[model samples]
Target chain A: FDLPWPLRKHPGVAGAREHCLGWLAAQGLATAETFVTWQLDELAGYFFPRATQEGLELATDLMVWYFAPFDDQFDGALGRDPRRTAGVCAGLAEVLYGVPEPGPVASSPVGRALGDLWRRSCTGMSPFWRTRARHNWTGYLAAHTAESVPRYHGRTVDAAYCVRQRGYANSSHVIMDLIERTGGFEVPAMVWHHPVLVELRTLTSEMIGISNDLCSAEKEEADGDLSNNLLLVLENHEGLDRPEAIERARALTAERVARFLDVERAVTDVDCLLDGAGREAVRRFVEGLHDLVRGDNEWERTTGRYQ
Target chain B: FDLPWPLRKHPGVAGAREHCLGWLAAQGLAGLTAETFVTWQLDELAGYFFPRATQEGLELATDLMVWYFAPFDDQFRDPRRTAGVCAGLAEVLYGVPEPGPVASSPVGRALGDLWRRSCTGMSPFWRTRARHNWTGYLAAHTAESVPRYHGRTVDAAYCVRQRGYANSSHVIMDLIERTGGFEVPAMVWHHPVLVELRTLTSEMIGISNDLCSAEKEEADGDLSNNLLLVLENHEGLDRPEAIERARALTAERVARFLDVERAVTDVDCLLDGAGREAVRRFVEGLHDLVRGDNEWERTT
Candidate 1:
């Protein structure tokens, strides 16, 4: 599952990995064995190498923890039966909004981890951030069911269509919230859904998802799981195969990266009134994305989970 | 569309209607005319849909939302006109802006206050859901309007999808929040049984709406929109026969939804005990949605 390029881990990433696994066990989400096999805890630090601050680094790890498990749980139980998924999402929503779960403790591990994460993540955050974070998380939850739904094979999807589904899997929007949280700079509250910011975020997320898709295709082939990968999409929708599909996916990722830089330039031109402090924060956020791309690829190289 | 003697209008509806108009005026959205205020007999419809909602919290809250979007779109003389209005409304619900001066735009103005209240009063989860459902409503308007604007004659199946988007059932469905009833657990909202219940409830309301609005729509020259009209247009059926066919369609949906409601409720579902109780309460509201729609449509 290693990428063609050499993967690099940030300083103290190993410590972040250890800290995250301990936090996972403490949160009752996974055991040491479960955490190790996933390697998400180890890889998380490499994925967010720029999140050098202890808090931000741990936050980054938890971001991986939150998304990976939730998606895993979706693929396991919730995907086939939306009603059960909905209830689980509802339970998770209860804690997301600070509503007390009335009856008993959550039976589902995903729900428990989610509720635990909400309590921890909400600390020292703005109500706007809290609201936005919760909103994005729900979108993440929503995307899981959307992707997992059975569709007819004859149903053809365009790249945009494929990208939209992958966007859900990307959970890049949630990552943006994390970028704000861990980067220690609030995206201007007003700019939460600005099209430029949205485009930029999606491009970054798209690249991540695509890179993972390409790198993991061989591994995914083993499980015969071809749900949301771009390469399979190229084959199924456009009749490309093997190296052709991989090349197409790579080309698409490269195109997206170009668009990201284009969007970054455009945002700078448009949001000219942003203060120096704001600009710097935005810089870190964008750089944070670059780190995510390279570091995530690096982590993909290190982990044989997909292989 | 008349209710039985037992389904009398909620007594406070007159005031609820009046309060809604006044609230609209306050929001700078009553749009400078009495004609704009009571397009669907807001008070009376409130009396039907929420027979228990008073001029107070539930009635006032539900009545304004119920009246504003549907009725505001009613101001349009044609589908193309509706398409434009939907674009304007989409901006309001999709991602609300920072609160500013109360502007003249009715959709933004109404939702500005309404969404603020939702954020304040409801959980982020419910608020986000309410927003999601509202977009579905706007999208329904867009979807229904565009083809008609292109002079297409839609079929009954298309009307069903369109009605699903109009989302009138689910709109009222969320009124539980306003009524201070049991907050639906987020899990229940997505629960397969609950999703089925929600869809069926909304479909029933949407169908009843199409039925109730059929005659008015005909008079208004809004022909391509309703289930009856779509049946007539597509199948070349006469009015009487289309009406007959529509009646059968309604009965089938009603039976299916009710059957599932029972089977899902009686059998194994994902919800817990209290969740079940809350759903029972919601089911009661769904029951009222039908009976009241019957009462209002029958008599009006």
Candidate 2:
């Protein structure tokens, strides 16, 4: 079932796939199929060329915000904290999608098309969920916070938790911004859409956490929490006495994850407005996330620990 | 005529004479007898080299005296005025010349002869006719207190006197210091010789008469004495009064000349203790003073 001439004549989509295959081959991967399958199963991140530019700009802006409090503080390394991850992601979204404004879509055809596509696929995510996830992943990756998971089996639970929280927060903020700008509607958006989006982007990520248990298990592990299996071999293992603390942290993480997923589903449902190409790109991106999580889980299982 | 090994067996003297004659010929003066004669005559005053270094030294000393005071007061150009020249000359001599207690002459034959020759030839000539002639000329030259005879002509006279005094003082000082030590006698060793020499040198040169005459002439001419010829030529012929003033100046000049001659005779008597060669040398020097008067008269 071949598409009509105009439908098949879309530029760059097929070529981009081929180029990605070649890139994988150069990395010594087996074949295009294997590479694509691996990418789809084990890497859930979006592969937008513009994402990197957006990420860098976001990082710079977050750094600027972090240093705004202490006039003399200008260390980029210090600003790379889990708490700042959400703001960085929000900044990235602003760079890539631009600040949205209500206007007639038909005024300029190209802009109208872009506007329409973004409204359907990237405006559904709640800014709060994005911000939370970014903070969690960045904290895990930077090893600057503690994890609730006491028996995790890799590096210090604190360090792992920090980095993981940072990563989650950063990735979710970008994903959520994309959802919102595309006019996607998620459940969390119904509750606190405007306030979360406005405030989440403005938060200085370098501030100490107002609430405890801000990091994920991975973040804790990275910070050398020895209650985890991998870090147990390291000195100074002290497990938490109360289960209530762990429960509270778990609840926070779960809530944030659910909110993020809801935005993802909402954005995909209206992906039709994004055009066939845009819809396919979102599908690939979702598939990539699933694959990444699967691979992450598999590695953890095989190694007898999550790091 | 060409006697070998004679008393004076120096062929070099003949050679020197021939060389001088050849030079004169090349200068184109061999055939111009009048010019040669005139040039020879002029050489007595100008080209006549001072025989004794002490005589030359005195001339230099006097020039220095004039140079010292010339800047202070224009009137001091008359070095022969009062005891000023003597005072200035004495000060310089006392400082620059070696002090007494000079070393005695060496005792060997050759050394002794050398010492004797230096003592006779290079002794100070303060009381000599040379000093008198120098004083007379200096008086005739300067027009500070005196009025100039002719303005331009007076300047020429001043220049000539300055140069002669400078030359004689320098030559005399050089001769004495180089050969005769400060203690060397003007004739032979006398206990009070140095004191006598100093007194004679300081006062016998008629500098007083010359200096006084300059002042008198300056007053009589109303400072017009030196510029007389120039005034007469430009302003008209001299009146009888001017002529009388001129005669008075001439008479004053003659009186100074007589004093100078008397000083010369006194210096001759002082030279009686000297050897025959020294006496002859002194007489020849006196004859030079007479010969040298031509240039002075011409300027006058």
Candidate 3:
């Protein structure tokens, strides 16, 4: 495990998981054992270590709930269908937009859950953050559909396809944005495109994704899931055996972590990366990323789901 | 000249054109004469484009038309000049060109002002598309550089790309703000059938444009860019066939849109009442597109 920081889970996760499963059950999205078997409790634990505020904890809890069944529902049979996936995402978009009597409405369960999540997340957020969040969300949706299209699924696609589809569909920007959201701070728009910052984000996302592919490889292989892991891609494309693919995937994660460390160190000395206020946002943002990478690795190794 | 349907000119457009001219003068983008704005016939176009929008929404839409048409004034006369302005247009549209003491040029300032206003006026939900569409809009002209420079026979797909970039229908998407009418739920946009409807509307409008403006466009050095001529030249069709082909293209796309329309409204439809109404409204606008365009061709 290349976790650079110690794993930290919040105490509130126990209550959070209970709450998520209860509402999830009421909606018929999941049952108690399935939630437990999924070890999504740790997902709640992972989400709220620094929830930092009363309302923040509740919101984070709901987000954990939002993403759980969300994972299975989209990544399952429907993930292969671009048209329906578009419909589903569009449905979610209606919910986020607060459509109603005067506006349009969503009819899907996915839409309802996301609408609930959207209503909760609206806490004195700025127009800019909301815009950024929506953009990231669209990126996730678009990437998901592109990967789901027949040519991309269940085949040995190109190297470029594997990297981006693996990386983008993971919703890295969506997850990264909560860094500022939870902290109630933001990076100045000026510093957003800083090379060092993008560098850090790219490597962290790639590393985490590789780790995920490694953990999920077994089940994904059994289910005949396409694009479920890098090992699958390596085995399929590079003509390597599963063990050989796994070894290569492991090395890829190692290289990224090393580079992530280099970029992480370089960013501090970049001087104008951010001002004092922006610098504080950067610290928290990087910390939030640390929380994520550490949480992902720690959760995967600790949970029975991986085994 | 082609004023067939009562051109219920929005109350705001006359003022919009004047205000647009003033901004153009300020931006050094004075490609068109002030009369061009008045004569641009946007009142008819506006009435056709978003009939359901609010008076204020119509004004806002007119503001965009002014910005779009302002360049058409002088730039078409000198496309090299068009290229000169496009670089600045792209910079400003990408985001604000600069900040602090370094003042942006008029073109940059006006574009930035329009863009910022558009963003603030529209919903964050549509911001991504609005921006993405606007980028393509600017690029539509920029990429014309290639064919204009190399004398390449312009592709027919550029006709489609230009329509999307033009975003005449999608601007109504922005108009949805003041319109407060039903919204085109992202799902409808995603619905491939609906996408076909959108494509049909865009091409119907685009091809209609290519046909109606044939006389005026013929004089321009960029005749290679015309859809009728391009289609004709590319496929070795005669002038009659080209004209025939162009009309057939619009009619064909319209038929396809109608077919897709039934599919979207059928039992498999996922939209609620307002959602369905939104699609219906846009489809209805597609009717205005053809009718108004035909009238426009005869007059202009």
Candidate 4:
């Protein structure tokens, strides 16, 4: 993965992993064997390499239960059912907005994990950050429902659309928000949402999404889920063989990384408008994105999930 | 000048203008004289930009523009108070089952009339895209209001981003689809190239329109939020310098839009016959919008 960003991990990774595994066992989102084998805390550590001990612990739970096991259901019957996806996503959204559904949903591990995560994550965060987090998480949930429509119908989406759908479905912005939470500073609303910053966040999303899709392409194809993978999209749309499609996907990832670096220069210019504190905050925020993208690539190379 | 899009105007301009003006007069959204002048402006806009539109399409497009601008005066006068009005307009775009919320007011009534007319032949997907564009348009105004209310001035990038939304280019492009009687495929519509074209055209319209309106807004005490004003206030440029800088910015975006349009061919090769045709017309509509909007701004 010839990317330029540095690889670093949190100092509290060992303790965080222990806490995360114990919490997963208590939460019942996954089995004891699954929790021990998955080692999701390692994924959290790589993604949030600089997170505080508390932040890393929360992020660890976020990965282990919410994003991992919960999202993994989409590979089967649940992923193909748009209405059901929406019902589940809507419940998750209510949890994000601090309003829980008063039924099995609220009592479910998914809801309980998210509710606990949300409460812990927003402990000292600003209203601005909270609002942005909620919006991002809602979009993340909605993308699942939207993408399920294409899957449900067995529609063959082109690579362009597939890349974007993957971007949205991956919920990279929620991860980016955690970048802030991990760093403990709220980027100004205007700066956080600016087009340049928006582009950067998207660039990171595409990088992570394309890489993940590439790694998971074979397994997903074997599972009859070729429609959701970029390499398969290229193979289907462009009539390229699997090896050539893999080549094309890597080429596309290279272009996106180059573009991300191109935009990073402009970000330096945008940073000049901030105060000393904000400028530093923006710097760390962007650096967090860089670390997150690089770390995801490293984790992808080693993770047994794909294997 | 020197823009590459061919100059074209609808043959139904005369009939559409009359129908549009008459409708405006009856609606009482604007004064009779105001209706005449504004209709003249938008008549040229809808006629020239949507040169391929049907006669009724032309009329509806012109009237929608008139109703669209009617609320601007109120919004600009006191943006804080218009939050409720924007909310009601949002309900209109969301296609609330009944006109229960936004029916009584002039802006709401005009919008409801146009909204239903526009949705007649469009697909559900098209309606959702248009709804999102219109919703973004409404949200931009609310966002713009905050800076003005607090006597705050934003930086260049924020101002540029806000202007793109406030320009209503996406909403106007929805009219292009509505009048053309074809919905762009969801994949093509959301493609990065298409999205960039819409954005570049938007920035072109917004930056140039700000240049034209700078003097009047300055006189009207609303100049502080204009892009030119932002450049002037933030970058410490004199008036002429700021104007030149803004003009250069618009020309650069215009040139960049031309380059970006080339990527449409890449998107084109990916679609089948009908989808390909939809992309073709949508891009043509965007080109016409840029040229036609520039022409309109020049006359002002």
C-alpha lDDT values of all predictions = 0.59, 0.30, 0.57, 0.70
Instruction: Report the first chain's TM-score for all candidates.
Output: 0.82, 0.28, 0.82, 0.90
Q: List where candidate 1 sits over 4 angstroms from the true fold.
A: A1-10, A29-42, A50-52, A60-90, A98-110, A215-226, A269-276, A302-306, B1-21, B24-124, B129-300
Worst 10 residues of 3 chain A by lDDT: A98-107
Tell me the tens digit of each residue's lDDT in model 4 across B87-106.
Answer: 56766655555565555677
DockQ ranking, best first: 1, 3, 4, 2
lDDT of 3 by residue, A1-307 (tens): 6556777777766666667656665555554654456666665456447764543445444545445656555666666465676555555555565444322225455556666665555565654455556666665554454444433244445544455446655655566766676667776433343445656776767766776677767766754435546677776677788889767776777777786876687555333333487678777777777777887777667763354
Off by over 4 Å in 4: A1-307, B25-30, B33-40, B75-79, B97-103, B148-158, B219-223
DockQ per candidate: 0.07, 0.00, 0.06, 0.06
lDDT of 3 by residue, B102-123 (tens): 1265545666766776666455
- For each candidate in turn, the interface RMSD (Å) is 9.1, 61.1, 9.2, 9.6
Q: Give the candidates in order of TM-score, highest first.
A: 4, 1, 3, 2
Models 1 onward score TM values of 0.56, 0.19, 0.54, 0.59
Instruction: Give the per-residue lDDT digits (tens) of candidate 2, residues B225-288.
Output: 3333323443454644434444444344334444333333222332334433343343333333
Error of 2 at B256 (Å): 10
| Candidate 1 to native Cα RMSD, angstroms | 10.4
Ranked by DockQ, the better of candidates 2 and 4 is 4
Which of the numbered candidates is closest to the native, going by highest lDDT? 4
**Candidate 4 residues A89-145, lDDT tens each?**
666666654332354566677778788888887888865566557656666765655
Interface RMSD of 4: 9.6
Docking class of 3: incorrect
Candidate 3 TM-score restricted to chain A: 0.82
